[PDB]
Amino acid sequence: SALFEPYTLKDVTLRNRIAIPPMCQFMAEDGLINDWHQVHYASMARGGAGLLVVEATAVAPEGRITPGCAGIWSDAHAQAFVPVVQAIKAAGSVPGIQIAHAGRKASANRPWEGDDHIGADDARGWETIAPSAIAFGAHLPNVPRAMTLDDIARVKQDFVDAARRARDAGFEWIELHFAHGYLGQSFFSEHSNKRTDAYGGSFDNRSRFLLETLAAVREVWPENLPLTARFGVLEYDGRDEQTLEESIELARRFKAGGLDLLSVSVGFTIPETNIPWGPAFMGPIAERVRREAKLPVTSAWGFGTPQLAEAALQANQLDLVSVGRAHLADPHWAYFAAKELGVEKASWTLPAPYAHWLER
Amino acid sequence: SALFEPYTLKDVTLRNRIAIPPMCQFMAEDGLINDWHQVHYASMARGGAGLLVVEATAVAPEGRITPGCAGIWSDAHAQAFVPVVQAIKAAGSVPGIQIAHAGRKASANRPWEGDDHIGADDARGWETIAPSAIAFGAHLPNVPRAMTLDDIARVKQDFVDAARRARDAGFEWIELHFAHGYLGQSFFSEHSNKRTDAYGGSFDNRSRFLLETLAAVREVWPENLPLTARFGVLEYDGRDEQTLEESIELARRFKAGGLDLLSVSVGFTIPETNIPWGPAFMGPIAERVRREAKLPVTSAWGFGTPQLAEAALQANQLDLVSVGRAHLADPHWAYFAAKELGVEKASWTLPAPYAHWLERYRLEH
Ligand SMILES: Cc1cc2nc3c(=O)[nH]c(=O)nc-3n(C[C@H](O)[C@H](O)[C@H](O)COP(=O)(O)O)c2cc1C
Ligand SMILES: Cc1cc2nc3c(=O)[nH]c(=O)nc-3n(C[C@H](O)[C@H](O)[C@H](O)COP(=O)(O)O)c2cc1C
Numbered sequence: 001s002a003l004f005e006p007y008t009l010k011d012v013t014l015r016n017r018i019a020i021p022p023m024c025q026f027m028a029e030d031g032l033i034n035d036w037h038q039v040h041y042a043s044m045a046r047g048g049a050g051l052l053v054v055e056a057t058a059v060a061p062e063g064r065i066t067p068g069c070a071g072i073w074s075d076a077h078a079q080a081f082v083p084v085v086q087a088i089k090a091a092g093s094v095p096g097i098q099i100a101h102a103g104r105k106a107s108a109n110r111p112w113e114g115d116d117h118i119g120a121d122d123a124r125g126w127e128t129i130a131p132s133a134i135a136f137g138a139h140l141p142n143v144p145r146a147m148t149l150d151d152i153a154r155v156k157q158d159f160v161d162a163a164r165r166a167r168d169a170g171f172e173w174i175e176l177h178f179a180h181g182y183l184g185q186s187f188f189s190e191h192s193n194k195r196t197d198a199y200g201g202s203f204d205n206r207s208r209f210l211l212e213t214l215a216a217v218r219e220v221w222p223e224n225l226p227l228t229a230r231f232g233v234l235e236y237d238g239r240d241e242q243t244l245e246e247s248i249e250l251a252r253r254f255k256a257g258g259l260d261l262l263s264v265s266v267g268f269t270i271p272e273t274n275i276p277w278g279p280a281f282m283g284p285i286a287e288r289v290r291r292e293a294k295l296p297v298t299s300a301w302g303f304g305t306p307q308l309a310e311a312a313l314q315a316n317q318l319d320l321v322s323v324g325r326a327h328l329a330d331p332h333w334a335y336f337a338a339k340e341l342g343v344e345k346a347s348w349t350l351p352a353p354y355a356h357w358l359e360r
Numbered sequence: 361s362a363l364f365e366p367y368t369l370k371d372v373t374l375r376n377r378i379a380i381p382p383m384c385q386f387m388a389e390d391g392l393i394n395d396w397h398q399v400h401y402a403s404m405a406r407g408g409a410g411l412l413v414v415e416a417t418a419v420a421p422e423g424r425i426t427p428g429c430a431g432i433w434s435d436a437h438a439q440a441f442v443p444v445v446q447a448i449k450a451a452g453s454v455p456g457i458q459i460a461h462a463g464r465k466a467s468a469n470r471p472w473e474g475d476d477h478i479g480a481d482d483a484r485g486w487e488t489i490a491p492s493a494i495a496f497g498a499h500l501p502n503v504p505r506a507m508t509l510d511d512i513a514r515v516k517q518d519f520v521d522a523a524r525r526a527r528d529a530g531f532e533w534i535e536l537h538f539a540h541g542y543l544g545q546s547f548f549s550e551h552s553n554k555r556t557d558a559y560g561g562s563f564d565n566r567s568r569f570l571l572e573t574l575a576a577v578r579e580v581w582p583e584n585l586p587l588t589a590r591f592g593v594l595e596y597d598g599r600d601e602q603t604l605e606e607s608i609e610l611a612r613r614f615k616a617g618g619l620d621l622l623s624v625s626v627g628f629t630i631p632e633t634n635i636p637w638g639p640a641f642m643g644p645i646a647e648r649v650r651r652e653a654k655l656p657v658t659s660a661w662g663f664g665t666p667q668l669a670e671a672a673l674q675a676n677q678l679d680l681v682s683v684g685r686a687h688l689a690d691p692h693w694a695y696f697a698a699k700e701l702g703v704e705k706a707s708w709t710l711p712a713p714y715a716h717w718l719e720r721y722r723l724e725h
């Protein structure tokens with residue numbers, strides 16, 4: 001089974017090709033994780049996935065999506081991640097973290113608490129920032145404050161500080177969150193970036209915030225640990241061929257700037273789109289990024305059935321298959337996949353106290 | 361769905377009829393549980409089961425099955441369970457514990473490390489105790505020493521102390537391990553009990569250790585929390601009708617002694633048996649105990665699919681369905697069962713950070 005072949009990248013060896021992508025839990029308080037996250041991450045890691053990327057973790061308080069989002073904007077926040085890192089590693093998985101800034105989508109309620117913007121004057125809300133003073137719209141109406149050059153410098157340094165904290169907490173894999181309509185994605189997209197200075201307009205200018213942030217993080221993130229990013233490569237906004245071509249060029253520049261692997265996703269920059277509502281539509285798109293930018297990739301969105309994950313690898317569309325919601329449903333999904341694909345000694349995907357009893 | 365109806369026993373209410381039965385993890389050191397157990401139990405409790413009975417926990421060091429078994433023979437051992445109790449409760453489940461003494465099956469290797477008795481020249485082992493100096497046989501050849509009267513008094517007091525510690529740690533449900541060929545079961549069975557004193561040689565004498573231990577625990581265990589036991593009611597040794605009749609009479613005496621629920625199992629007292637493993641094969645046996653002894657019951661050993669669990673309740677065989685190995689495979693099995701049975705808002709079997717995203721309407725529209 002291709003899904004259960006190991007994978008090497010820099011000094012890291014993943015025991016299989018199953019990655020758990022970042023999934024916000026909305027359970028932190030003032031950015032601090034707690035026993036929700038400790039059990040959640042340790043259980044999924046014991047389930048057998050080779051890599052576990054911890055949820056979008058804000059580089060600054062205003063970069064949280066919600067009041068429940070994790071943060072890494074102080075040393076105390078970073079120290080709280082140490083037992084999570086160590087439990088993931090003790091399970092034989094590789095601990096990663098996605099560091100993030102929600103941009104204009106920040107200051108929102110938790111998804112099961114309305115999912116909508118909280119006003120900045122509410123005690124629970126705060127002021128949001130973005131490349132341009134233009135709202136997402138729909139349930140996120142609040143107009144963000146357009147960033148100055150000083151704001152750009154400050155946020156970049158927050159990403160750098162977050163990466164250094166993640167390093168010292170023991171994460172072995174980092175992912176910059178440049179996808180999903182948050183700050184980085186919104187600098188890239190002409191829908192949200194109306195700037196006419198050095199950070200807007202041309203392809204070079206729209207790419208600048210992302211490339212400068214990557215380069216600044218690269219100075220502090222160890223050369224021997226994978227440096228990765230998530231990026232939305234199309235929007236399903238009627239401009240897909242041109243947008244994908246530009247995104248592939250940015251991926252080439254990421255590679256030239258030291259990126260080791262790209263998590264290929266959708267932009268979600270604006271609500272006026274027509275994104276597919278079915279599984280594995282990203283397969284051929286991720287494949288094109290991988291082949292044309294000559295860079296390892298992962299992708300997600302419906303690959304959480306064992307045969308689909310296996311097919312994507314056999315087709316060389318992906319190097320790792322990210323499986324998100326299936327791991328919320330079943331933290332031992334990797335074992336389920338091994339069983340379904342007929343892997344020899346499939347139960348030993350799990351630790352001995354489970355594996356011994358579940359042997360075929 | 362019957363499987364998702366609440367159940368009340370004494371002053372404890374379970375949110376559904378899915379119980380996670382005790383399952384040894386073999387990961388403790390010197391009886392102390394650790395991060396293995398913390399995550400293991402918290403994750404299963406978040407999975408939605410209404411009751412989680414923590415694994416066989418030794419009342420005394422020599423009553424561990426293996427060097428990896430949990431213990432509760434000191435207050436520090438009990439304190440180690442406090443965060444497990446709290447995590448199970450925080451998840452909305454009810455924390456129980458099975459307190460145990462492995463008897464002649466003690467001093468064994470972990471199942472994936474040979475599963476057999478530790479040899480004499482291995483310093484990890486210890487002398488075992490039992491009603492009589494007779495080995496189980498097969499892969500458990502070590503001969504135990506026959507208990508003295510003082511040993512009997514001491515082990516009973518160890519059960520009392522263990523129950524008091526479990527109570528003080530916050531457990532809301534206790535299960536005495538009188539099954540599976542361990543110390544209590546071995547007092548009841550004529551295969552293993554060769555005594556001629558007050559503790560063997562008649563039905564009353566063979567029942568005595570179990571009834572005295574129950575009564576001693578009852579003095580310290582709160583009236584308002586379920587007092588339960590697991591007991592092997594037949595052996596599949598060619599003596600089933602007579603053995604089941606005696607076991608059901610003992611169950612009636614457990615009820616008279618304040619037992620609130622019986623976990624109905626197989627004796628496993630000796631290896632020379634022919635157990636007819638199959639789907640839900642214990643259903644009719646559990647129903648017979650339930651009806652003849654007039655005691656609520658649970659059982660296990662093949663109910664671990666959503667339809668088998670639901671059917672055992674619809675057939676009036678069980679009050680709670682114990683689902684063991686399926687929860688090792690999938691800690692969120694209770695959610696899986698709710699989904700498979702078409703329960704309304706099935707994903708809300710889980711906490712919100714999972715339930716929101718797994719809502720069937722959200723997934724389908
Ligand atoms: C609860 C939840 C939280 C998510 N949080 C993040 C996040 O923090 N960062 C991110 O890049 N994507 C996030 N996403 C997207 C997932 O990483 C993934 O792409 C998506 O769930 C699709 O994969 P799946 O079909 O296997 O679930 C989240 C998805 C879910 C369901
Ligand atoms: C790993 C494991 C450990 C077990 N440990 C115990 C135990 O501590 N106490 C007990 O009474 N039964 C124990 N048993 C038996 C289970 O409680 C249960 O009866 C058995 O798994 C059958 O139910 P199932 O078909 O749902 O798995 C154990 C079973 C397993 C698989």
Ligand SMILES: CCOC(=O)/C(=N\O)C(C)=O
Pocket residue numbers: 024056065179180268
């Ligand atoms: C829909 C795209 O947005 C995401 O997946 C996400 N983070 O990236 C969350 C928290 O939902």
Ligand SMILES: CCOC(=O)/C(=N\O)C(C)=O
Pocket residue numbers: 384416425539540628
């Ligand atoms: C087979 C009967 O014995 C059991 O189920 C048991 N404990 O009760 C263990 C640890 O295996």
